[PDB]
Symmetry: C4
Subunit: 25 residues, 4 copies
């Protein structure tokens, strides 16, 4: 398993790419 | 748990979304 | 090991650097 | 212990913030 602060920071990263891919889209 | 350079890069990522969110106000 | 969301976000980031060193190689 | 693709992914993270403290306030 990974640290929680880490799983958070990633979710923040994964959601960013989405809002990007919609902003662009 | 999770490797510390990986807790590092994270504290930076979260803190970054903070400064940014704040940058709008 | 490290959670999957983190191995996912990471692949993005490594693939992010990749899409750069090329866009400007 | 975090995945390697993840420990790597974060050197390029910690290496970004560095090029940054090296540019602006
Ligand atoms: N930008 C990221 C920092 C750290 C490593 C990787 C996954 C998470 C945690 C988000 C990219």
């Amino acid at each position: 398993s990974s640290d929680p602060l880490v799983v958070a920071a990633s979710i923040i990263a994964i959601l960013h790419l989405i809002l990007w891919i919609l902003d662009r889209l």
